Amino acid sequence: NYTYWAYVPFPPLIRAVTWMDNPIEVYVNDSVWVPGPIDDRCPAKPEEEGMMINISIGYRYPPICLGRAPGCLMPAVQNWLVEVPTVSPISRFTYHMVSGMSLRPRVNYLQDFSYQRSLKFRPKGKPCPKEIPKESKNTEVLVWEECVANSAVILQNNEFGTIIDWAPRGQFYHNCSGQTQSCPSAQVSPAVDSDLTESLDKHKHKKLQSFYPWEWGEKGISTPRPKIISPVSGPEHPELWRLTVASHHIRIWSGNQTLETRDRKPFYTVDLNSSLTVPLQSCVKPPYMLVVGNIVIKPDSQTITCENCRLLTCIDSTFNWQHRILLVRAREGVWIPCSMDRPWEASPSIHILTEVLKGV
Amino acid sequence: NYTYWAYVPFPPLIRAVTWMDNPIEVYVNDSVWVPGPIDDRCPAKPEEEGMMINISIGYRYPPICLGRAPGCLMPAVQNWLVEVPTVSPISRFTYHMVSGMSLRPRVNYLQDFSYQRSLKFRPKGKPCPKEIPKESKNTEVLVWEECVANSAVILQNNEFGTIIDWAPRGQFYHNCSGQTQSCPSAQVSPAVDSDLTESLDKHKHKKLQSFYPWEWGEKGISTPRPKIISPVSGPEHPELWRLTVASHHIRIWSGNQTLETRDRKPFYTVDLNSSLTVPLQSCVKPPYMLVVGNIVIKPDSQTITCENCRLLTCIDSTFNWQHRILLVRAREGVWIPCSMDRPWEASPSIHILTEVLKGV
Amino acid sequence: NYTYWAYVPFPPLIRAVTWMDNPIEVYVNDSVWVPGPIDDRCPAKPEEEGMMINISIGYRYPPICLGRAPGCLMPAVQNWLVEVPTVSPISRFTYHMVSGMSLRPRVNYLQDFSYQRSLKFRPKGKPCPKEIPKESKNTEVLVWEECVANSAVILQNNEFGTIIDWAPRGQFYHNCSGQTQSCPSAQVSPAVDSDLTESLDKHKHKKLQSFYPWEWGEKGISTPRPKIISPVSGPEHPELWRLTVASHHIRIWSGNQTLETRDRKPFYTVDLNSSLTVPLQSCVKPPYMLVVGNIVIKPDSQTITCENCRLLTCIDSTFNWQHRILLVRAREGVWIPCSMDRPWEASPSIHILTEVLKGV
Amino acid sequence: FIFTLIAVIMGLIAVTATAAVAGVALHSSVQSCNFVNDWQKNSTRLWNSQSSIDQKLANQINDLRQTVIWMGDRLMSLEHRFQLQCDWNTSDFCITPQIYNESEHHWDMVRRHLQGREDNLTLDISKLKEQIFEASKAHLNLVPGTEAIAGVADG
Amino acid sequence: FIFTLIAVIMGLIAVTATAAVAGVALHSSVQSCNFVNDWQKNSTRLWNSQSSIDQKLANQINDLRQTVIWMGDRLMSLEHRFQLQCDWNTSDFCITPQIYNESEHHWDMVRRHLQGREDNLTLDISKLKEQIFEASKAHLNLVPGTEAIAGVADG
Amino acid sequence: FIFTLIAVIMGLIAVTATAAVAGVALHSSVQSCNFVNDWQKNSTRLWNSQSSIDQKLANQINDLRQTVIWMGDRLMSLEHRFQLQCDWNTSDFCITPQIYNESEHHWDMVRRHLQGREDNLTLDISKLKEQIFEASKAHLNLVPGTEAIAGVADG
Ligand SMILES: *[C@@H]1O[C@H](CO)[C@@H](O[C@@H]2O[C@H](CO)[C@@H](O[C@@H]3O[C@H](CO[C@H]4O[C@H](CO)[C@@H](O)[C@H](O)[C@@H]4O)[C@@H](O)[C@H](O[C@H]4O[C@H](CO)[C@@H](O)[C@H](O)[C@@H]4O)[C@@H]3O)[C@H](O)[C@H]2NC(C)=O)[C@H](O)[C@H]1NC(C)=O
Ligand SMILES: *[C@@H]1O[C@H](CO)[C@@H](O[C@@H]2O[C@H](CO)[C@@H](O[C@@H]3O[C@H](CO[C@H]4O[C@H](CO)[C@@H](O)[C@H](O)[C@@H]4O)[C@@H](O)[C@H](O[C@H]4O[C@H](CO)[C@@H](O)[C@H](O)[C@@H]4O)[C@@H]3O)[C@H](O)[C@H]2NC(C)=O)[C@H](O)[C@H]1NC(C)=O
Ligand SMILES: *[C@@H]1O[C@H](CO)[C@@H](O[C@@H]2O[C@H](CO)[C@@H](O[C@@H]3O[C@H](CO[C@H]4O[C@H](CO)[C@@H](O)[C@H](O)[C@@H]4O)[C@@H](O)[C@H](O[C@H]4O[C@H](CO)[C@@H](O)[C@H](O)[C@@H]4O)[C@@H]3O)[C@H](O)[C@H]2NC(C)=O)[C@H](O)[C@H]1NC(C)=O
Ligand SMILES: *[C@@H]1O[C@H](CO[C@@H]2O[C@@H](C)[C@@H](O)[C@@H](O)[C@@H]2O)[C@@H](O[C@@H]2O[C@H](CO)[C@@H](O[C@@H]3O[C@H](CO)[C@@H](O)[C@H](O)[C@@H]3O)[C@H](O)[C@H]2NC(C)=O)[C@H](O)[C@H]1NC(C)=O
Ligand SMILES: *[C@@H]1O[C@H](CO)[C@@H](O[C@@H]2O[C@H](CO)[C@@H](O[C@@H]3O[C@H](CO)[C@@H](O)[C@H](O)[C@@H]3O)[C@H](O)[C@H]2NC(C)=O)[C@H](O)[C@H]1NC(C)=O
Ligand SMILES: *[C@@H]1O[C@H](CO)[C@@H](O[C@@H]2O[C@H](CO)[C@@H](O[C@@H]3O[C@H](CO)[C@@H](O)[C@H](O)[C@@H]3O)[C@H](O)[C@H]2NC(C)=O)[C@H](O)[C@H]1NC(C)=O
Ligand SMILES: *[C@@H]1O[C@H](CO)[C@@H](O[C@@H]2O[C@H](CO)[C@@H](O[C@@H]3O[C@H](CO)[C@@H](O)[C@H](O)[C@@H]3O)[C@H](O)[C@H]2NC(C)=O)[C@H](O)[C@H]1NC(C)=O
Ligand SMILES: *[C@@H]1O[C@H](CO)[C@@H](O[C@@H]2O[C@H](CO)[C@@H](O)[C@H](O)[C@H]2NC(C)=O)[C@H](O)[C@H]1NC(C)=O
Ligand SMILES: *[C@@H]1O[C@H](CO)[C@@H](O[C@@H]2O[C@H](CO)[C@@H](O)[C@H](O)[C@H]2NC(C)=O)[C@H](O)[C@H]1NC(C)=O
Numbered sequence A, B, C: 001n002y003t004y005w006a007y008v009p010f011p012p013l014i015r016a017v018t019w020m021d022n023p024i025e026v027y028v029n030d031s032v033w034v035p036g037p038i039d040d041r042c043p044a045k046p047e048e049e050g051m052m053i054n055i056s057i058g059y060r061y062p063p064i065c066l067g068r069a070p071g072c073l074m075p076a077v078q079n080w081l082v083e084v085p086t087v088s089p090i091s092r093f094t095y096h097m098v099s100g101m102s103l104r105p106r107v108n109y110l111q112d113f114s115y116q117r118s119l120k121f122r123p124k125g126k127p128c129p130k131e132i133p134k135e136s137k138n139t140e141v142l143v144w145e146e147c148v149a150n151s152a153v154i155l156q157n158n159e160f161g162t163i164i165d166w167a168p169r170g171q172f173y174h175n176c177s178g179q180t181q182s183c184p185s186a187q188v189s190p191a192v193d194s195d196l197t198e199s200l201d202k203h204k205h206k207k208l209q210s211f212y213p214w215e216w217g218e219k220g221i222s223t224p225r226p227k228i229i230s231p232v233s234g235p236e237h238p239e240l241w242r243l244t245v246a247s248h249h250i251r252i253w254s255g256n257q258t259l260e261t262r263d264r265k266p267f268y269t270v271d272l273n274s275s276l277t278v279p280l281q282s283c284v285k286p287p288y289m290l291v292v293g294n295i296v297i298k299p300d301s302q303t304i305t306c307e308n309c310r311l312l313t314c315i316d317s318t319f320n321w322q323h324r325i326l327l328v329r330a331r332e333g334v335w336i337p338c339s340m341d342r343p344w345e346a347s348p349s350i351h352i353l354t355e356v357l358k359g360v
Numbered sequence D, E, F: 001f002i003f004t005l006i007a008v009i010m011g012l013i014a015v016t017a018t019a020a021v022a023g024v025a026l027h028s029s030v031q032s033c034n035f036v037n038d039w040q041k042n043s044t045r046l047w048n049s050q051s052s053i054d055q056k057l058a059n060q061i062n063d064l065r066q067t068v069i070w071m072g073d074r075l076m077s078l079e080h081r082f083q084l085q086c087d088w089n090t091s092d093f094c095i096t097p098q099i100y101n102e103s104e105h106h107w108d109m110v111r112r113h114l115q116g117r118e119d120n121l122t123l124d125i126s127k128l129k130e131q132i133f134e135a136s137k138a139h140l141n142l143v144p145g146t147e148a149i150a151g152v153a154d155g
């Protein structure tokens, strides 16, 4: 036998997409509610979605994974609220709200379950607004604008790396400045995970009542832009939220804040109602794919293993979050030794003369 | 005969540039009055400009054509006005104006010949100013800034597609809010097509008189950025106005708005005068070319035909708008079957042995 | 002999980087004090730095050179000052200042050694601030923002070309408007070249006293962005300052402006002190290199010659400004005639038959 | 991706205008490979003789989308060309060993492809490339056939 | 750099999932070149049969960094491929005349390279390429050796 | 377009500095092809041995203009190389069959081209490529001439 080195420029292998990569394109099929890029077509080969595969690969930089496991970012519901001032002695604002699946911040268990925050590596950009504009036209159409928050939330702070996000997160709260300790200093989330899955066809209502006015913050219709800062420094990835939002329906709310006199003192109430949901689809294009299943990441040996897992292109509202998502790409050329039964040859010219002599 | 498939990587064919393409570069030869990119050289082969050709091609997306015919955008004069506040009891403003060949909006024949407007697909960008700045330095140099108008004008709404432009258009008008119906609601264009062609060397004057003050809008020294929205969605093309503006001279005006008492009530007058014009040249570079002639577009079969038409690179003020302009590019490789008199061969090794035996 | 034309795709030659090139990347190893891009690694081949070479090349556009010679930009110290208003009857501001090696403007010898200035080719961008902000949090971290000054400084106005820079330069001065001729109208530089080299480990103090309040201008933490305007027009090069700043330590200052009554009239004093310096390293990456030595540029014949000069990749604080820096890049393919002892051949097929007949 | 060619024999306009007469016959029926060679000869010469990118024009580009997309098509075309097997006697363009059937590909599909159409009556390039890739392997075409080896091995 | 392939026989998902069974054997020991040929056969066919860039998706790209970095890797790979010397009987992929030593490169280095690792126990690609470049020159490999010329020149 | 090479035998600085001694003779007169081969040998080895783009540096790039202009030149150069005809015995660089006239191209034109000049006394590369393209066609050079076929066919 003769074994030689061989170069295969297009191997049928895949590589994991890492946090040191630059952002990739994720296409959604609904321009009304989600910014671009937009594509409403089905996958080019719909019969191939969901094929099973066994995976055992390594990496150099931490892979990008979504789900509930070590090394993957957990999903949760995020709320974006538009506030319109009202000239009336009994009402303060009229509300429009959008709820969707997004990236979950970590929680401070010392405080009242507040988000873990960081001030490291503040980027350049337009600051998030602190005041409601005096006028807002075309409330039905939602305008998404990139925004920089007063502080960054922490998405991961363990041996798999440190991920932070400078996009704002919105919640209901009370000022509690210039007041006594009776003022509650806890934040309230008007929507939870159940509002996106359970009883889609029915009418949903939410009510908040307190003796103090309700404020919303941080403001800004802006989506997460996470990045890694330890042990390596990488660029922002504003496309990851697009994959999570298509895993569930998005819910559209409307409502108001009103005021009435209770116990000889002002009483403030927030009402929100919804009977409308929108289904979405989010896809990546070749040479990018998705690996879905029980992804296991081992940070000590830098190995990714997943047994009996599926290969997909698109995420829709039938996704089960028992599984996890790993972003992959078709790999570059590789070098491999292979064995032949004859020595290496450059041309068949000697070979041709063999049958010429036989033909004489 | 033996007929085989052949690949030609550099065929001498051309492809039409469509509205789904990204913007291309157009070079002007005058930096003082027109923004970049700038190139003042003549075409590399001046002796080849104007060669005649017969064209019969197809397309997939609507082609970009300029002129007066179905499927092409009509040109018209646009006016950009710089206005400076004046502290005087008899004058309101001093004026600087530029008039150039541009893209013509459609006209509402129901109203007083107002422009057809649309609110669809509002882009992101700096809003167009609504108030005159209190001070303006260096009025002699004109600063062009991209701008988003309150509404988009419509350039085409037929079976060839829907083209809209979110850049502002400026006209003279009267504020009729809080007034009677005696105030005219019409809008006046201070310059027309004739001011760019007829009597270039003569002095041009324009006078407007009314009992109501004259306002200019929309403001902003901004050029058209048209795009297609139906039946396909494509990017903006801010370079198309550069080709039209070179087909005529541009005219520079100056003037003022003054006030005097007539019939015991204020009387407002606008004076503009001009004795200066600037000739320009606009060019595209290879692999892009221009097809000029009687271009015919058939939307049912998606065919472009043009008999006895010229191939050009540059547009100057000697252009005749009896003809139309089609943007084209050199085509990519093509596949063609051709016939040989012998079977396909990989090497001449067998051929070489033929004369070796003959040479023995 | 037979001499044929040959093409060498990767010759071991170099080309000079000119002002018509687009900006290249320069990596610094300190994210705290200098913006990105950041790389703290040593050169890949540290044993090759400083190899000697003789150079004799031509050019088409003026080369980019730094140092003290015809055709090269001279370095000098630039100061960036942060001002924080203080509410106190005896003090005006608290100060933070950074001093580093930068590009030197030309000097008007007619005036009180003021900078030569130009108003040509004003770029688009955010104007430089004219007023001190009332809210400046996190003064310890310095935020660098691109800025457009009221006027451009001139860096070169000779037969080698005209280089101008629209970035601001800051100095101490008095208003001297509404005052008498006794008001000094000269600008003062709080730091000089000696403050970066002499007595690094010692304490540095600077004091300014006058009967008129001290103002700083132009404001803005913005680095030079020079460009060529004559006889050719090229893009800005905001990376050249990164190479100069690493040739010396950068000095960090702090201080205040205070007020006291002297001779029954207000007396204003500026105090600055420093006991901290930071060393830096700046590098370029292959295929870019640096040529360091006695670089000579001849504009009449467009030749660059340098005898016994070193090749480098990184600049640090041990650099001697007796030498100069020329930016170079590995060259593209070239055409060269070479001679063979036999005629040109396409295949060895005839050669192979020669030993076949001999082997019979 | 942008060049200024002053000293070339023919410009892009002359190459396109002069080849149009012969392009009429190419659109109507199958021609000989010599006919195709004369038609594309000056176009291939023009695109093999540009020297360097015009730096004066290149450094003024603001939006890179159209340039990058153009470069991606050129890179893909070069990759496919490196894999093709071509007849030895023609070097301006590649002639593959794939025989034209004319029962799978009626001439109207070829004419529509030459005109720049991509409708459902046009020749499918992706399907055609798959056939050529499988039929052009070296172990099937590099060694001359029996009828050629026997003909030359007469003694 | 982005294509929509509708009429191809196999998509990227099927190509990746079907080859995974044979990839287990490739990760364990040295296989024959025929075995490697079958493993990569459908992947090479897919990447030689795309027609044109999907313009609908390409014109919507906002950040070009990831696209440009991908194109740079492809351009570098094509440059190195143009310089390699390959066995005549295999055209899908290049077999170099460099003999595998197995004393310098233990199989564990090869397995780590196939898995996508770049640690200090992985095969050094840059060092391997330098060895192959110096050992594959035309004046050392194009002319068949004496044992081959003598064997065929028996009369 | 940006790499970090740690384990290569020679860096870019050493390749440039070591070859400068021989470059003096190349600037003065015509040398043999063996001389040119030795002069460029280590430079060609360096540019065939880089492994992958340094991702730590590449993802920090803000302005892509210089990188795209560099890639466009490399793509154009690769396209022209794929069309050239080269002598079989030299594979590091391409030797064309175009005979050097020395009456059309005085040596001073060649020296100015090697120095990187583009004035009116410099060799015109575009005109030279057109001349080489027309003279290097396969039907004119692949078949050896009569004096070579007759010499080997002595019996
Ligand atoms: C972007 O891409 C996503 C991909 O998911 C599309 O989402 C799909 O949207 C369609 C249209 O809205 C949805 O279809 C609708 O589903 C409902 C019925 O199915 C439910 O109920 C039955 C039993 O009744 C169950 O078997 C089933 O599992 C579902 O729970 C109804 O809301 C709709 O019915 C309407 O149409 C049918 C047929 O025409 C009529 O009979 C009805 O009277 C009624 O009019 C409808 O069928 C679909 O479920 C979504 N797919 C999901 C969520 O995975 C987006 O539409 C697409 N967006 C754009 C803009 O292209
Ligand atoms: C960008 O590129 C455009 C290309 O169109 C250039 O435009 C040309 O500019 C030149 C210079 O301004 C113009 O030439 C001028 O034309 C006029 C004379 O020609 C007219 O009149 C005669 C009879 O008098 C007719 O025969 C002829 O057909 C024309 O109708 C005059 O305005 C000028 O004359 C001046 O120069 C001549 C010669 O030096 C003197 O004799 C005169 O006394 C006088 O000084 C001049 O010749 C030319 O017409 C333009 N071309 C057009 C419009 O197509 C731009 O200049 C260029 N810009 C930059 C910045 O490079
Ligand atoms: C970016 O890259 C630059 C590359 O220049 C790095 O700069 C180097 O930084 C180090 C660490 O600060 C400097 O080393 C320090 O130098 C001083 C001593 O050297 C001087 O004095 C001796 C004699 O006393 C002379 O021989 C010598 O020439 C110098 O004049 C001291 O400040 C420091 O000493 C400290 O460490 C030593 C050893 O650990 C202890 O003995 C001391 O007690 C003390 O703790 C130190 O050695 C080095 O000089 C810099 N190089 C230069 C200026 O060229 C940057 O650090 C790097 N930045 C980052 C963020 O990576
Ligand atoms: C080597 O090159 C020489 C010179 O080439 C000429 O000068 C260069 C500097 C460039 O400008 C070239 O483009 C230019 O051709 C060639 O000699 C030339 O040969 C031609 C063809 O035989 C001669 O043309 C003829 O000359 C006379 C007088 O006009 C008449 O017989 C004909 O009408 C015809 O024009 C030409 O004069 C001659 N030039 C010189 C300067 O001697 C030479 O052929 C070439 N060697 C080759 C190709 O092997
Ligand atoms: C491709 O380019 C070549 C030139 O490189 C073109 O060949 C040229 O064709 C013209 C027109 O037929 C020839 O002109 C002829 O000259 C004389 C009179 O001077 C006479 O024979 C004819 O009346 C005619 O005018 C020209 O000589 C010839 N040039 C050559 C052969 O070098 C060719 O036509 C081009 N082909 C295409 C398809 O573009
Ligand atoms: C690469 O793609 C080819 C097809 O282009 C694959 O070959 C195909 O393999 C399948 C599975 O073995 C064959 O199906 C077989 O068909 C019959 C019943 O119809 C029977 O023999 C088996 O039960 C099996 O189902 C299919 O015919 C065959 N297609 C061919 C030869 O054209 C090949 O497996 C792929 N290889 C890789 C590594 O991806
Ligand atoms: C291209 O690179 C090669 C190496 O890959 C260079 O060859 C090397 O040249 C040096 C200097 O002549 C040789 O050193 C010699 O070593 C011994 C003593 O140790 C003695 O023969 C001499 O005194 C000399 O110092 C070195 O061995 C040699 N390396 C080899 C042959 O592998 C070559 O010079 C480079 N050429 C260019 C143009 O850059
Ligand atoms: C929340 O409830 C309000 C109030 O009922 C809904 O708004 C009304 O919707 C009905 C049904 O289309 C309309 O006829 C009314 O004109 C709407 N306005 C009012 C003041 O009654 C609203 O649609 C609900 N929001 C959501 C998201 O379902
Ligand atoms: C474009 O096509 C027209 C129409 O066929 C050509 O004009 C005819 O040319 C023929 C051939 O010389 C003449 O016999 C006719 O008299 C011409 N005129 C007609 C039919 O009206 C024309 O030459 C073609 N143009 C180009 C540039 O090739």
Ligand SMILES: *[C@@H]1O[C@H](CO)[C@@H](O[C@@H]2O[C@H](CO)[C@@H](O)[C@H](O)[C@H]2NC(C)=O)[C@H](O)[C@H]1NC(C)=O
Binding pocket: B175, B177, B178, B215
């Ligand atoms: C046109 O008229 C409108 C309506 O009066 C002007 O807007 C008003 O501007 C005055 C300025 O004193 C304000 O007091 C009003 O509150 C404005 N009204 C509204 C509804 O906004 C507008 O400025 C005028 N435009 C021009 C160009 O003169």
Ligand SMILES: *[C@@H]1O[C@H](CO)[C@@H](O[C@@H]2O[C@H](CO)[C@@H](O)[C@H](O)[C@H]2NC(C)=O)[C@H](O)[C@H]1NC(C)=O
Binding pocket: B252, B253, B254, B273, B274, B275, B276
């Ligand atoms: C419009 O007319 C004004 C007023 O005549 C012109 O401005 C004068 O131009 C002359 C001729 O150069 C100068 O001497 C005067 O100083 C200018 N000012 C005044 C107040 O008279 C103006 O140039 C004309 N505008 C155009 C565009 O031709």
Ligand SMILES: *[C@@H]1O[C@H](CO)[C@@H](O[C@@H]2O[C@H](CO)[C@@H](O)[C@H](O)[C@H]2NC(C)=O)[C@H](O)[C@H]1NC(C)=O
Binding pocket: C252, C253, C254, C273, C274, C275, C276
């Ligand atoms: C300039 O001098 C001030 C005043 O001494 C320094 O600030 C003090 O630094 C010391 C030493 O760390 C601290 O203990 C003090 O708290 C600081 N403040 C005061 C008010 O004393 C300052 O560090 C010096 N600046 C530089 C750049 O060296």
Ligand SMILES: *[C@@H]1O[C@H](CO)[C@@H](O)[C@H](O)[C@H]1NC(C)=O
Binding pocket: B001, B339, D032
């Ligand atoms: C082969 O093609 C030629 C033209 O190239 C034609 O003249 C000849 O008739 C053909 N032979 C046939 C059809 O047998």
